[PDB]
Design a protein around this nucleic acid. Structure first.
Ligand SMILES: [Zn+2]
Length: 1211
RNA sequence: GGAAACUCCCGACUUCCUCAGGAUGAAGUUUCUUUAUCCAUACCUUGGUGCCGGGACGCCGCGGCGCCUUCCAGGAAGGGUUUAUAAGGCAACAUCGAACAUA
DNA sequence: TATGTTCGATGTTGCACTAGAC
DNA sequence: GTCTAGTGCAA
């Protein structure tokens, strides 16, 4: 038919296109002038693939608890976790730096008089120079250079020094310091023969520098300084940590709030140092330390060493230069404690395995931490300004300012004290307080500033959840919630009894109902039938659909008591459609059922009837599980009754009576609905606060009713990028005969790599060995290696595949095959389909195209909860080990260049999508004739619409234990979303066009459309952008040469700017405001909205219904009455509009509905999958759609095309 | 668009198409589709299918049956309706806010 | 405003080179 | 020649 590209072909089309993006073109250009292309300096993207790993059984795999334990070491902020220690370190008076050198200088702060020297430098050079202080000077000389920075030419030396000193390329400039670097650089080139020699001989270099400087001015001896600090260094070799006397120590403090202080402590110093950097970045520099570099020693050598030596006795006293008294030694005790507490690294090891250490996780750990640091620090600042910019009120002001100190001290801006744990507690409480008052705000506002709540202070967490413990808490939570449920229920009714305020138990509805219908309606007949409905519906709802005892039981009630016809009951109950009670003066009125004429039950009776029934199930529910389908239903009934029971009160309630008497442990937060307990008598408002128990009850109930879940532990370690290429040893390969006609394979036989079976069947493992050893580029056999039966596997992270012989080849990051030794039963086989596996190959054989990146090991332990001992107990089920391997598509390859000629206009039908293509060439007023037009199926859509209104139970799929809400709905949208973009992508290829899509305006369905737009159109928001780049392979924008478009921005207060034209850029899609794209006609070219407005601002229908317009003659029709009501239904043809309407004179509005009704007519057959008004015809007798018909999508598609086209009043 | 099915909901236990490549050929102006061995082993989704079960609607002589039409006396011309050539896949963690809806 | 559902979004990781000791 | 513990390099 018109079959579009899908799968690999579309991935190829999209990727190719990426390469044609504006940036990519730039990159290629750069290569001409640049010559060599950097992998990291060109467009790329990451494509992650997950492969479960087929670990062979008979492997020494650890218990999940053992696996679980480590993971927690890594991610939890409790004592015995890395986060604590890092926190302990700062808290307990220490500092972490990226390198060893910066550490030594810091400690020996005294030896280097940076303050004066800079002072002097300014006077003499008359400008402050970046990083030109003795302290920093020492590191620079001492530091080493890599890559092409090592080249020992005068120029390179100057280049580096320039950069280090923030000196700009000013050759012509006769700057005092600029000309000093040249002299210095020039005088350094001369006297040392390499950079490596410069580091070794660092006082000589220091000297020289001081010597040169001597000529310009009087400066102290750097080298002396260097020697001086050098003499006093006590620090362990390469320590990236140091102790500060100026620091404040806060040992033995709360784990929950420790993070708060360290950030605060560091933040405070940010100010002392008068740093120019952002606060967010100052702490990340100083906490984690620049790529986990600080922790590389600290987690491996600093940890080891800090357990083995004693705080004071080399004694960790002189090594870290502690206070001689114990002014600040309380500090070492807290960190010494932190180190032993952290368990030694365990059970994860490298190849030829030896255990991995905490230093191997520095990158990820730092990323986790710094992410939080960014977020938390941003909060405070938000908080402070948040603050800066009825006894309780008394409390606020008094208590408000104290909040400033909390925020300020937290932020490190107050040196009055370092924040107390209580400081923290106060903040929330205040939050507690402000919030109430805000509501009060709203309290008298509907009678007729924002003391709005303030945001939370962030926290950190992590580690596998304790499944059993959490479950048990729920169980106890549930028992207690029910228990206290009753008491609040019992007492309030009891209170009512004494004050005798109870309304008629069943009158309530009648009264309440009757209030709804604002009219006489005889005495009490019109409102009592509807009162009988209501009871039925409510109780009707609980058991409709369910197949439990109670549900069927309820059904029986309806059956025995004969409220409705059997057919009727079934449809309500069994088929699950239609309803017992219609809201009066219903706007939809979807054929309200007929309660049986015969039954003569009275409203008072039903409640007595129902009440009796209710009693029955209550006896029964006693024999069932709390977590049960039956109980679930009963609760539904119980709530209705209980509320109805509660609702029968005509007087307000005493606060002491209704106080929601539930302990705190069992619950957490009450929304704002419940922000009260002067003026607290609540007129029938106990219902909502009352509803809490159920909702609260429901949450725990859900958790315990969930049969399956999984817990996840994930690990990412530097250097975990090695995937292994192994041969399928057990198989015999019959190379096809026709393989030898190609020169390559011809070449293969000669090399004698191959080893045959007596039968002439190649043996893979044996042959594999040959290929490894035949000296040279392995690349010779890459083609064979791609054909030779092989498997991609991964080494067991816990055991040691030492290796005696070179079994297989192992592949790294940029394609780095390395003949390694693989043991038997030591590899895990990656499990995935062909396309997936193939990429893995490409990563090996073809690195420039794509290469492997660091992977993540994910261990999902699946647990399942089941009921025993009248409790829910969880038991471990299956463990799956998976590997997520990022694939970097360097791409950065070009093909035969091209551009978009046509345009793709897209419209979305609710049962698919429609398009229209226009040529770039036809840019004149006339001839905007669409090259092509059509529609595409896309079934998912109807599935989405048709499911959301059905409200069916979401598909059960394993959920993380952490997740407490269903994500089933989300995934589907993601899916539906995919197919929609696919087609557009598909269409795009054929027509070499770039799409134009309507801004949005079924609501579930809109969510997806919103998303679809994310993929093509340009948006700033990171989420929207991220989606796009995924599709277009990191591509940014494609600009069409020779075309451009008219833009119209705004200035201020919604004011029109100016019509400016610029070159046209498509991302690869652009947008158009679809204002009544649908109303207008594609062929006609005339909207109907014109007289719409014109007439509204300031009626001669004919016999068949003709109207005098400005632009033609609009012929409005009514339901044809030619053959009778019963018949069309007979064929199912929907009663077409062939019959005219002529009432002589019509209202302004009347035609509006008429025309409304008149254009988007519906479907030909009743048995359509379309309910939407799929068809629209231009009204004029002129338009060809009048007699013919069209699809709204195509039409709208066209208008859309045309409208956009006008814009590009460019060439 | 090739080949197929036939009213319409809600539920219950089975089968799995498609999939990335390598040396070939036979044809059809730098492409289109066929076909041989051969490596790649099939992950996560959206799905499809077979099956019972509980029901419903539109006719009809509590029960039979099921897309509308029309012509030979159960059969030949037409209409519609629905589709599988399946479709998608960038991971992870921690944080924060509320966000939509339904009558 | 009220009845029940749910996502929406920020921030971070998915380093690479080599002097000196294994 | 092999490896890892340091930390520079691009930003
Ligand atoms: Zn028209």
């Amino acid at each position: 038919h018109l079959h579009l590209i899908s799968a690999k072909a579309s991935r190829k089309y999209r990727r190719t296109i990426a390469c044609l993006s504006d940036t990519a073109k730039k990159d290629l250009e750069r290569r001409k002038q640049s010559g060599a292309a950097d992998p990291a300096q060109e467009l790329s993207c990451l494509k992650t693939i997950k492969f479960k790993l087929e670990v062979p059984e008979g492997s020494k795999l650890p218990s999940f608890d053992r696996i679980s334990q480590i993971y927690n070491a890594l991610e939890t902020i409790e004592k015995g976790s890395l986060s604590y220690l890092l926190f302990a370190l700062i808290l307990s008076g220490f500092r972490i730096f990226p390198n060893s050198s910066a550490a030594k200088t810091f400690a020996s702060s005294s030896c280097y008089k940076n303050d004066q020297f800079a002072s002097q430098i300014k006077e003499i050079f008359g400008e402050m120079v970046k990083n030109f202080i003795p302290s920093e000077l020492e590191s620079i000389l001492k530091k080493g250079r890599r890559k092409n920075n090592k080249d020992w030419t005068e120029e390179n030396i100057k280049r580096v020094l320039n950069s280090e000193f923030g000196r700009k390329n000013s050759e012509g400039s006769s700057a005092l310091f600029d000309s000093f670097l040249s002299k210095f650089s020039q005088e350094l080139f001369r006297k040392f023969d390499s950079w490596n020699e410069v580091n070794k001989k660092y006082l000589e270099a220091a000297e020289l520098l001081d010597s040169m400087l001597a000529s310009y001015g009087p400066f102290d001896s750097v080298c002396k300084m260097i020697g001086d600090s050098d003499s006093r260094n006590s620090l362990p070799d390469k320590s990236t940590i140091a102790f500060t006397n100026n620091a404040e120590i806060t040992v033995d403090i709360e784990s929950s709030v420790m993070p708060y202080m360290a950030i605060a402590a560091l933040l405070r110093e940010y100010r002392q140092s008068k740093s120019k950097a952002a606060p967010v970045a100052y702490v990340q520099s100083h906490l984690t330390t620049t790529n986990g570099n600080g922790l590389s020693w600290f987690f491996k050598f600093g940890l080891d060493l800090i357990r083995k030596a004693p705080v004071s006795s080399g004694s960790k006293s002189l090594q870290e230069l502690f206070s001689v008294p114990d002014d600040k030694l309380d500090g070492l005790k807290f960190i010494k404690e932190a180190c032993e507490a952290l368990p030694e690294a365990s059970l994860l090891c490298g190849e030829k395995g030896e255990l991995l250490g905490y230093q191997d996780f520095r990158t990820s750990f730092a990323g986790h931490i710094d992410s939080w640091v960014a977020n938390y620090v941003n909060r405070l600042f938000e908080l402070i300004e948040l603050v800066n910019q009825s006894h309780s009120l008394e409390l606020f002001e008094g208590l408000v300012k104290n909040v400033r100190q909390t925020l300020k001290k937290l932020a490190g801006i107050d040196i009055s004290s370092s924040p107390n744990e209580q400081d923290i507690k106060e903040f929330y409480a205040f939050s507690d307080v402000l919030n109430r008052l805000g509501s009060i705000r709203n309290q008298i506002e509907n009678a007729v500033k924002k003391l709005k709540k303030l945001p939370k202070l962030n926290g950190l967490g992590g580690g596998v959840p304790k499944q059993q413990e959490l479950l048990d808490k729920a169980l106890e939570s549930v028992k207690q919630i029910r228990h206290y449920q009753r008491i609040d229920f019992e007492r309030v009714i009891q209170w009512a009894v004494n004050e005798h305020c109870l309304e008629t138990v069943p009158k309530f509805l009648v009264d309440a109902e009757k209030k709804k219908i604002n009219k006489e309606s005889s005495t009490d007949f019109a409102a009592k039938e509807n009162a009988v409905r209501f009871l039925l519906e409510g109780i009707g709802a609980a058991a409709r659909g369910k197949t439990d005892s109670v549900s069927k039981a309820a059904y029986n009630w309806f059956v025995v008591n004969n409220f409705l016809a059997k057919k009727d009951l079934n449809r309500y109950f069994i088929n699950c459609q239609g309803c017992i009670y219609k809201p009066p003066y219903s706007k939809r009125r979807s054929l309200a059922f007929a309660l049986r004429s015969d039954n003569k039950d009275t409203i008072e009776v039903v409640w007595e009837k129902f009440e009796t029934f209710y009693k029955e199930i209550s006896k029964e529910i006693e024999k069932f599980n709390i977590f049960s389908q039956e109980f679930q239903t009963f609760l539904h009934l119980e709530n209705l009754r209980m509320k109805l029971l509660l609702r029968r009160i005509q007087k307000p309630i005493p606060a002491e009576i209704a106080f929601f008497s539930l302990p705190q442990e069992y619950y957490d937060s009450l929304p704002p609905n419940v922000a009260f307990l002067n003026q607290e008598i609540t007129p029938s408002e106990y219902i909502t606060q009352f509803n809490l128990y159920s909702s609260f009850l429901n949450g725990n109930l859900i958790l315990l009713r969930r049969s399956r879940s999984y817990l996840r532990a994930k690990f990412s370690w530097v250097g975990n990028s090695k995937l292994i290429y192994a041969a399928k040893e057990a198989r015999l390969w019959k190379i096809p005969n026709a393989y030898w006609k190609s020169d390559e394979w011809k070449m293969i036989l000669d090399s004698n790599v191959l080893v045959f079976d007596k039968a002439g069947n190649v043996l893979p493992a044996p042959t594999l060995k040959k290929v490894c050893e035949r000296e040279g580029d392995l690349r010779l056999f890459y083609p064979l290696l791609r054909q030779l039966p092989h498997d991609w596997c991964y080494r067991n992270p816990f055991v040691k595949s030492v290796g005696r012989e070179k079994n297989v080849i192992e592949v790294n990051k940029e394609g780095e095959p390395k003949v390694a030794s693989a043991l038997p039963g030591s590899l895990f086989r990656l499990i995935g389909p062909a396309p997936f596996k193939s990429l893995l190959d490409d990563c090996f054989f073809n690195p420039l195209d794509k290469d492997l990146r660091e992977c993540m090991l994910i261990v999902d332990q699946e647990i399942s909860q089941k009921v025993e001992a009248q409790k829910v107990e969880a038991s471990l089920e299956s463990c799956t080990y998976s590997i997520a391997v990022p694939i970097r598509y360097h791409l950065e390859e070009p093909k035969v260049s091209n551009q978009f000629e046509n345009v793709l206009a897209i419209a979305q039908g609710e049962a698919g999508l429609a398009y229209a293509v226009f040529s770039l060439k036809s840019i004149g007023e006339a001839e905007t004739k669409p090259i092509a037009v059509g529609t595409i199926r896309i079934p998912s859509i109807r599935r989405l619409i048709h499911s959301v209104s059905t409200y069916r139970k979401k598909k059960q799929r394993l959920q993380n234990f952490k997740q407490n809400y269903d994500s089933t709905a989300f995934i589907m949208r993601e899916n539906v979303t995919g197919d929609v973009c696919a087609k557009i992508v598909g269409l795009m290829k054929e027509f070499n066009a770039f799409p134009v899509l309507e801004y949005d305006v079924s609501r579930q369905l809109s969510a997806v459309y919103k998303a679809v737009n994310s993929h093509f159109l340009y948006f700033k928001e990171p989420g929207r952008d991220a989606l796009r780049k995924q599709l277009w392979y990191g591509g940014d924008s494609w600009t069409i040469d020779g075309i451009e478009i008219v833009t119209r921005e705004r200035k201020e207060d919604g004011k029109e700017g100016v019509e400016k034209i610029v070159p046209l850029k498509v991302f690869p899609g652009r947008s158009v405001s679809a204002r009544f794209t649908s109303k207008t006609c594609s062929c006609c070219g005339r909207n109907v909205f014109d007289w719409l407005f014109t007439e509204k601002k300031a009626f001669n229908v004919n016999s068949k219904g003709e109207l005098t317009t400005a632009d033609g003659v609009i012929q409005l029709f009514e339901a044809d009455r030619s053959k009778g009501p019963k018949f069309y239904a007979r064929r199912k043809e929907r009663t077409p509009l062939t019959k005219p309407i002529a009432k002589g004179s019509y209202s302004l509005e009347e035609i509006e509905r008429r025309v409304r009704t008149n254009l988007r007519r519906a479907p030909k057959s009743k048995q359509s999958r379309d309910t939407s008004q799929s068809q629209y015809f231009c009204v004029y007798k002129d338009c060809a759609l009048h007699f013919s018909g069209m699809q709204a999508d195509e039409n709208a598609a066209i208008n859309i095309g045309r409208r956009f086209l006008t814009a590009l009043r460019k060439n």
